[PDB]
């Protein structure tokens, strides 16, 4: 008698002066909003049920209706921004924060879930949730000696919701809120459950996405080693976010980058640069491009770990977007590397795969490659080996493309082309 009710029947019951009738009707509403597909979220909102639901949240005397309305509001909140807005507009945020203290673990978990959807909408609601004081109660829910004593699903929801409070960049979460949350985050990152680890990595992933001061407060917490370890996980849902975090960290100062190198992250790249999941391969190559954009001694670490042949590998064959990140990694390498290091790169066979990419329909990758060729010749010019390099580029159809790009349209291109042709060739 609470299965597949019509919205009007639900309205009929919730409007009666009978708490039990309202309870059945609320549960019926929750079931519509929980059905496999096409939950009537808009119809429920129009019927003006949100205010009734929000008010039921504050009924301590009847915990069951607190749960049902919490679940209904959770699913409405999981919709579009307009739908989530409807829930917030009803005054659900503070009502939910009060439920976090509930003696019924399943009710506060529902509250944790709803707050998760509200904060997940974006910067504005995220910061509004924080202003209503949700962080302390949430963290208090985790203030226990051993995370393993908490129910599996309850922990997964808390972590996920915390990762949403760390999410979004315009603007980034409040600095003081991040500091509050981090210590707990550092602890969840050492929990054995793969979902908890994934969402913890995602959170760190969001916090490291921004200015170097942001990256600093995370690195300062000493998590780089743990992130490197998770980088070698067998579960793709863990490797993906962990790699994104490590990648973000190396977009910062050289010293922040040295932290990932010291933690031994380079030893996992032979695998990542040939990973089956194209995305993991794209992210990894992009990460490499930022490391080769560092100090000569860091470029040298890339060399010692034998990662150059892997870059040659990616540049030679891979998804186009991955190849583009490879180009960058090369142009950066050649731009800050020593003469001896640029020579090594050539000995690894970079010239041919680099020349072949010039046939690509993408003015950006072409400027990047033409650029690298320049840097390479510049190094050869320092050894009187320019001719020898000309041959190689001439031997593998290289010149037959620079001369081509010489008739290109983009000013930056034909110029760079025209130059290389006269300064080292014809």
């Amino acid at each position: 008698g609470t299965v597949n009710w019509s919205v009007e029947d639900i309205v009929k019951g919730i409007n009666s002066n009978n708490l039990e009738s309202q309870l059945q009707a609320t549960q019926a509403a929750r079931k519509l909003l929980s059905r496999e597909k096409q939950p009537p979220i808009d119809n429920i909102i129009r019927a003006g049920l949100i205010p009734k639901f929000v008010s039921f949240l504050g009924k301590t005397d009847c915990s069951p209706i607190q749960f049902e309305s919490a679940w209904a509001l959770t699913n409405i909140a999981s919709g579009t921004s307009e739908q989530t807005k409807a829930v917030v507009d009803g005054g659900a945020i503070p009502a939910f924060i009060s439920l976090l203290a509930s003696p019924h673990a399943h009710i506060s978990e529902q509250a944790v879930w709803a707050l998760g959807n509200i904060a997940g909408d974006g910067s504005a609601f995220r910061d509004l949730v924080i202003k209503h004081g949700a962080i302390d109660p949430l963290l208090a829910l985790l203030a226990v000696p051993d995370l393993s004593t908490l129910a599996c699903g309850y922990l997964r929801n808390l972590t996920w919701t915390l990762s949403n409070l760390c999410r979004n960049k315009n603007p980034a979460p409040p600095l003081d809120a991040v500091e509050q949350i981090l210590p707990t985050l550092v602890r969840l990152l050492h929990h054995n459950d793969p979902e908890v680890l994934a969402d913890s990595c995602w959170a760190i992933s969001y916090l490291t996405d921004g200015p170097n001061e942001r990256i600093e407060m995370v690195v300062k917490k000493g998590v780089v080693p743990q992130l490197v370890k998770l980088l070698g996980a067998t579960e793709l849902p863990i490797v993906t976010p962990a790699l994104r975090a490590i990648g973000n960290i190396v977009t910062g100062t050289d010293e922040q980058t040295q932290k990932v190198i010291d933690a031994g992250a380079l030893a996992v790249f032979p695998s990542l640069l040939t990973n089956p999941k194209t995305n993991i391969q794209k992210e990894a190559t992009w990460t490499m491009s930022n490391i080769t954009a560092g100090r000569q001694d860091q470029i040298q670490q890339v060399v010692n770990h034998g990662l150059v042949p892997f870059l040659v590998g990616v540049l030679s064959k891979a998804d186009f977007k991955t190849q583009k990140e490879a180009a960058w990694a090369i142009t950066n390498y050649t731009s800050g590397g020593t003469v001896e290091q640029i020579v090594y790169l050539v000995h690894c066979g970079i010239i041919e795969p680099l020349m072949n990419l010039l046939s690509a329909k993408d003015t950006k990758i072409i400027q990047v490659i033409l650029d690298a060729i320049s840097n390479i010749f510049q190094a050869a010019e320092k050894l009187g080996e320019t001719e020898k390099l000309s041959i190689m580029i001439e031997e593998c159809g290289g010149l037959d493309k620079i001369e081509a790009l010489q008739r290109h349209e983009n000013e930056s291109v034909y110029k760079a082309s025209l130059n290389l042709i006269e300064k080292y060739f014809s």
Partner: peptide
């Protein structure tokens, strides 16, 4: 400016919201 920050952020991003089935 050697370092290149994030683009489209495409490990995509975990679903921002979850419906309780």
């Amino acid at each position: 400016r050697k370092k290149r920050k994030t683009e489209e952020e495409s490990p995509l991003k975990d679903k921002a919201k979850k419906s309780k089935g």
